Each structure stands twice: as C-alpha cells, then as structure tokens.
C-alpha cells in the first residue's frame, strides 16, 4: 500500500532515489527531496541516534532498524516514521554506494 515508501541515501544523507509514495506521506514531490539530505528534515532531537544507525549500517551487510523519529513535512509539521536501513555494497568496487531505506508511517 502507501503507508511506507522507499528511499536511498548517499553518505551525507542526500536522497538519491525517492519512490512516488513519498508524496502521499510527506506532501513533497520526489524532486523536492532528491538532492537534499534526510538530516535536513529530521527533528533536531533525532539527528544523533539516526546518524549513528546510519554509520552502523555502512559497516555491515545486516539491516538496522531505527527508533521512531520525527520528520518535518512540507507544511512544517512533523510526522513520526520508523525506518529499516541496509547498505548496498557494490560487490566489484567494494564500495558502499548508498543505503536503502523503507520509511514507514508510525
């Protein structure tokens, strides 16, 4: 359904993929999120633990589940999300290119 959407994030949080279900949940067009960092939208209280879970997943092929956190939507209010993250290691270049994130409304 449309209670979740999938994003991908480069190493500074930059959105590099946003599926169209994000607009239903966040009221942003995908193009508004693409090229901006997820950290720009996290509630400032949540930056620290989300950044540490992001750092964790860069060093493992296992998935990491965040705590619930608040995400600032287009009108400036906050919704609560929980994300499941895993990193995408290129098996030839041996580089983590991005992380995959399923973002679920709580």
Swiss-Prot record:
Tissue: Hair follicles (at protein level). Highly expressed in the adult brain, skeletal muscle and heart.
Intracellular or extracellular location(s): Nucleus; Cytoplasm; Nucleus, PML body
UniProt PTM comment: Ubiquitinated, leading to its proteasomal degradation. Deubiquitinated by USP9X. O-glycosylated; contains O-GlcNAc. O-glycosylation by OGT prevents protein degradation by inhibiting ubiquitination. It also stabilizes the CLOCK-BMAL1 heterodimer thereby increasing CLOCK-BMAL1-mediated transcription of genes in the negative loop of the circadian clock such as PER1/2/3 and CRY1/2.
Domain PAS: 2-61
Motif window: Nuclear export signal 2: 26-34
PAC domain residues: 66-106
Segments crossing the lipid bilayer: none
Protein origin, superkingdom: Eukaryota
Known partners and oligomeric status: Component of the circadian clock oscillator which includes the CRY1/2 proteins, CLOCK or NPAS2,BMAL1 or BMAL2, CSNK1D and/or CSNK1E, TIMELESS and the PER1/2/3 proteins. Forms a heterodimer with CLOCK. The CLOCK-BMAL1 heterodimer is required for E-box-dependent transactivation, for CLOCK nuclear translocation and degradation, and, for phosphorylation of both CLOCK and BMAL1. Part of a nuclear complex which also includes RACK1 and PRKCA; RACK1 and PRKCA are recruited to the complex in a circadian manner. Interacts with NPAS2. Interacts with EZH2. Interacts with SUMO3. Interacts with SIRT1.
Task of the protein: Transcriptional activator which forms a core component of the circadian clock. The circadian clock, an internal time-keeping system, regulates various physiological processes through the generation of approximately 24 hour circadian rhythms in gene expression, which are translated into rhythms in metabolism and behavior. It is derived from the Latin roots 'circa' (about) and 'diem' (day) and acts as an important regulator of a wide array of physiological functions including metabolism, sleep, body temperature, blood pressure, endocrine, immune, cardiovascular, and renal function.
Miscellaneous notes: CLOCK-BMAL1 double mutations within the PAS domains result in synergistic desensitization to high levels of CRY on repression of CLOCK-BMAL1 transcriptional activity of PER1 and, disrupt circadian rhythmicity.
Protein name in the entry: Basic helix-loop-helix ARNT-like protein 1
Gene: BMAL1
